[PDB]
Design a protein around this ligand. Sequence first.
Ligand SMILES: O=P(O)(O)OCC1OC(O)C(O)C1O
Ligand SMILES: O=P(O)(O)OCC1OC(O)C(O)C1O
Lengths: 217, 217
Amino acid sequence: TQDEMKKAAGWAALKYVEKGSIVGVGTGSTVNHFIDALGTMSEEIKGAVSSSVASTEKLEALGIKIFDCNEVASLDIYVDGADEINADREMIKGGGAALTREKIVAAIADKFICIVDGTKAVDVLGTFPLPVEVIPMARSYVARQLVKLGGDPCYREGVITDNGNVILDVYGMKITNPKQLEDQINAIPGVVTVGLFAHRGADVVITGTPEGAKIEE
Amino acid sequence: TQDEMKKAAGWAALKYVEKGSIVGVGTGSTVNHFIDALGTMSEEIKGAVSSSVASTEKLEALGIKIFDCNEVASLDIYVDGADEINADREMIKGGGAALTREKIVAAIADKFICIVDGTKAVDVLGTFPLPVEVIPMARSYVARQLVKLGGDPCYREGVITDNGNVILDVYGMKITNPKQLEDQINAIPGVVTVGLFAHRGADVVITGTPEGAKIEE
Ligand SMILES: O=P(O)(O)OCC1OC(O)C(O)C1O
Ligand SMILES: O=P(O)(O)OCC1OC(O)C(O)C1O
């Protein structure tokens, strides 16, 4: 879409931010606009936890104390974009970010504010490929089992996660039953994390549309 | 129960391997003895996959070609033991060995052959601690989720797996639906693997008795 639309929705996520708390912050262009909002709130919060390398650096551009996940028993909210989001507020995430890091911070937070532009909502999940983080020794075997589920897994060659794991991006599933899909893949030895955000979806969906932020809750 | 029982047991699995093929090898007192068996008919064996450093190196000094999981579609068999195994042939594995490679080598293998001493048959799994491998940034999270499930998880402090993750050994559990708890465990974000082989269990169960080994095909 446009960055003026990303902007709005990012700015709208600041409403949900409780005076004097540690804030869960994801990564990305829409997310960076939210961070600007928070910079207007550096003194009236405790800190911030981040699932992003770049996000951590910007939070430390406004003087916000970072915590790591092992330091808090909970977050109030975690604000992040998505790659694809359905009417059921289940997401495909982690296509261009730290999948594992994002799912952990997300499961630990109380509310999950999804801030998006016009182009993230889909009818059915799956055209945007599903990222699957895997133990390298299990890649082939996990690839076979995904072909078994109706996908076309593609080895994201050239890279590894910080964990030192590989990524299979799975093209060409029509993901009608996302809670059940995440069980199946979750069920596969070798599999570290699947980017299906279906069991813990968005609690609020804050979209940015040619006429402002529109919030769903 | 005894180191001769182990040895009668790991030798008795020897009858399960064939010519020109590739063997799955675990680790443990009792597989050693099977590794001790495997050498004698090394010439007819294409070579081996294993899930353990010690076995690998012992098979190597034997002139047994090692393969990796990325080279194969399948393995006729996996010989390994267990920490616990129930009447339903479900096992607690990886208190003692490399949880992730075992669960992975077992998944590529058609037939799992559990070689065991008097100490391994339980009726209800859970006395021997249940290993769960966990991305470190998630350790307390996954641990709060483990409590909910009637669990007392205990960080195995001072060590990590080859990839940099921690271990949580869960005590106090009465595990009567294993496939369920595995389901549930594979399902916390930050979990990497769980020491429940419940979906995929022991096909053959090889114990140690006083004279020969009881076997159960
Ligand atoms: O050339 P590209 O793919 O548009 O790269 C720039 C951007 O990368 C992103 O994740 C963006 O949201 C974005 O605008
Ligand atoms: O009695 P524990 O504490 O389970 O440890 C002994 C052993 O457990 C195993 O799986 C073995 O192969 C083995 O020798």
